[PDB]
């Protein structure tokens, strides 16, 4: 603790006084991941491996929930033409937790795949498929040109160029109504001031790379809107109570201890927050059981030392932490120098019952100094000498002897 004084002050010499050094570091031991037992696999291979898909005007929207999946065969193993992600780390997809996923199966030619990103402008990016700025998920694409193409062109899928206004996202357009530009009625067919909005794809093997068909499935992830379902095969271990360890609870992390819960909670409550808006309480995902979270690593390290030309003896002051439960220095934690103050436990100093004038302050009436084979002692600061004078009506004190005192006062300018 003499060497910890020089590291904070960044100086070679240490003067006489109390200095603040550092704070307590409690290293976590184990890791707790609680996950419920689900024997059902997610059917993500139904929408990925199917031959026939839908188009961009009306897609096939499937909901996948209450199962487990494997993203190592989708991401790590990759026989795919394009994988892209935006708001989620693509490496950590097997780690993180979400509620549900909405897969949209559609085929877009290779000239028009550059408009799939949040906040674009295009033919598909306005009147067909929009990505908002708060959209969260990934984009998976694959090259279908060696299978789904045709020499005379593939008319089985069609796409919408024209719409009257901007289409809201996550909405399918099934309307067969002819777009009317002017005041002439179209009567269901094309004509003067009438355009036919739904045209057919350009797909041929004889063209370039812009007309090549791509099967594109965009996944939609939802974070912290609900308790998670799909997740991944991370780990499942038993709880560790009354020990400071790392927490991972349904994707939400933390560091602290597990204690009992005396408060009445909602049965649908995943977790709850304290006055500091961080998680003080959590529900177990496997069975419905509630343990509180109280965080660790609180309190500072304060040192009490004289100058380096006097001695090497350093007293250590703990701040606000009770020392009955207990920096890498374990030597002064052995005991018998321990005195209890209001500010905390003071170790490395022998408490005496006398009352003197001190030098280095601590607090709460307890003050320390360097006195006499010499060691740092701590005591209560004296107020000066006590005088008991009798007072009556018939007594007066008039001084018969005078002196001249000269003092010195320094005011900076």
């Amino acid at each position, epitope marked *: 603790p003499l060497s910890e004084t020089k590291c904070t002050l960044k100086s070679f010499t240490v003067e006489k006084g109390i200095y603040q050094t550092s704070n307590f570091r409690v290293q976590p031991t184990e890791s707790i991941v609680r996950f419920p037992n689900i024997t059902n696999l997610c059917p993500f291979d139904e929408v990925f491996n199917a031959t026939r898909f839908a188009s961009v005007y009306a897609w096939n929207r499937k909901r996948i929930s209450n199962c487990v999946a494997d993203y190592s065969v989708l991401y790590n193993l990759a026989p795919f033409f394009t994988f892209k992600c935006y708001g989620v780390s693509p490496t950590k997809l097997n780690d993180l937790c979400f509620t549900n996923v909405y897969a949209d199966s559609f085929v877009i030619r290779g000239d028009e795949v550059r408009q799939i990103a949040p906040g674009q402008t295009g033919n598909i990016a306005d009147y067909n498929y929009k990505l908002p700025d708060d959209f969260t998920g990934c984009v998976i694409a694959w090259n279908s040109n060696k299978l789904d193409s045709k020499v005379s062109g593939n008319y089985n899928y069609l796409y919408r160029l024209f719409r009257k206004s901007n289409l809201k996202p996550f909405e399918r357009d099934i309307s067969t109504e002819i777009y009317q530009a002017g005041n002439k009625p179209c009567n269901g067919v094309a004509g003067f001031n009438c355009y036919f909005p739904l045209r057919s794809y350009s797909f041929r093997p004889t063209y370039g790379v812009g007309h090549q068909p791509y099967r594109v499935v965009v996944l939609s992830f939802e974070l912290l809107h609900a308790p998670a379902t799909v997740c991944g095969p991370k780990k499942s271990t038993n709880l560790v109570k009354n020990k400071c360890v790392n927490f991972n609870f349904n994707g939400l992390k933390g560091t602290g201890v597990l204690t*009992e819960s005396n408060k009445k909670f909602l049965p649908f409550q995943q977790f709850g927050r304290d006055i500091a808006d961080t998680t003080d309480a959590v529900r177990d995902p496997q069975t419905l059981e509630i343990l509180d979270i109280t965080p660790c690593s609180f309190g500072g390290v304060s040192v009490i030392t004289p100058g380096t030309n006097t001695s090497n003896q350093v007293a250590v002051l703990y701040q606000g932490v009770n020392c009955t439960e207990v920096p890498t220095w374990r030597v002064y934690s052995t005991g018998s120098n321990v005195f209890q103050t209001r500010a905390g436990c003071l170790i490395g100093a022998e408490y005496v019952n006398n009352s003197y004038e001190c030098d280095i302050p601590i607090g709460a009436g307890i003050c320390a100094s360097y006195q006499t084979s010499q060691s740092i002692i701590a005591y209560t600061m004296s107020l000066g000498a006590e005088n008991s004078v009798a007072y009556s009506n018939n007594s007066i004190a008039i001084p018969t002897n005078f002196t001249i005192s000269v003092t010195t006062e320094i005011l900076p300018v």
Partner: antibody, heavy 120, light 112 residues
């Protein structure tokens, strides 16, 4: 099948130190905590102490302070209990138990038992 | 902590009746919906076994004649039908307060 193993009987004089062995198998040693249960006949069960084996941190009874010393061995997956200066009232039946933690802490598994007779 | 006291010390129940043995607590063990009590049965020369966890439930491997109920500081141990292999010491335990305590014990006999 997780089964805790203890020797049958130990003999020690008063004033000396005695050491006991609790062997864990079938499960990882640092993932649980170890509890020690004292049984004196006619009094009932008494609680000695509880130790996290990975951190080597002990939780002891207030009456049982400085009588018992709890150490572990992570290499052999075997927990130890060391007593300091036993008396004539300290002759009892000692157990070790694995505490599985989910919500409330039960006692899942037990040992074979050890009877320590303190006499000269 | 919480000191447990069971009454009476010995109980003689004939075959075909229902036994009731109470474990009383000094303070309330009820928290987080599920309070904290366990029931342990120990034969002489044998280690004890886990029987009832969280007072509404039954451990697998334990037969269905061993059951418990009660709320607050007054808990009941309901054993019925009584059989001749059921004679052993009964113990109760709370994990609520640190450091935890153990019960005094109650011996059950069969009156014939």
């Amino acid at each position: 099948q997780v089964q805790l193993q203890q020797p049958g009987a130990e003999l020690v004089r008063p004033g000396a130190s005695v050491k006991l062995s609790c062997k864990a198998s079938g499960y990882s040693f640092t993932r649980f905590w170890m509890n020690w249960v004292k049984q004196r006949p006619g009094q009932g069960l008494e609680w000695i102490g509880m130790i996290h084996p990975s951190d080597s941190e002990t939780r002891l009874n207030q009456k049982f302070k400085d009588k018992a010393t709890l150490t572990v061995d992570k290499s052999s997956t075997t927990a130890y209990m060391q007593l300091s200066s036993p008396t004539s009232e300290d002759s009892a039946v000692y157990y070790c138990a694995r505490k599985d933690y989910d919500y409330d802490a039960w006692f899942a598994y037990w040992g074979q038992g050890t009877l320590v007779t303190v006499s000269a | 902590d919480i000191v447990l006291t069971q009454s009476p010390a010995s109980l003689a129940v004939s075959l075909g009746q229902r036994a009731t043995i109470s474990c009383r607590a000094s303070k309330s063990v009820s928290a987080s919906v599920y309070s904290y009590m366990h029931w342990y049965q120990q034969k002489p020369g044998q280690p004890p076994k886990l029987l009832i966890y969280l007072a509404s439930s039954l451990e697998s491997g334990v037969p269905a004649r061993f059951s418990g109920s009660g709320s607050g500081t007054d808990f009941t141990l309901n054993i019925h039908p009584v059989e001749e292999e059921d004679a052993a010491t009964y113990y109760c335990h709370h994990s609520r307060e640190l450091p935890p305590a153990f019960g005094g014990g109650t011996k059950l006999e069969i009156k014939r």
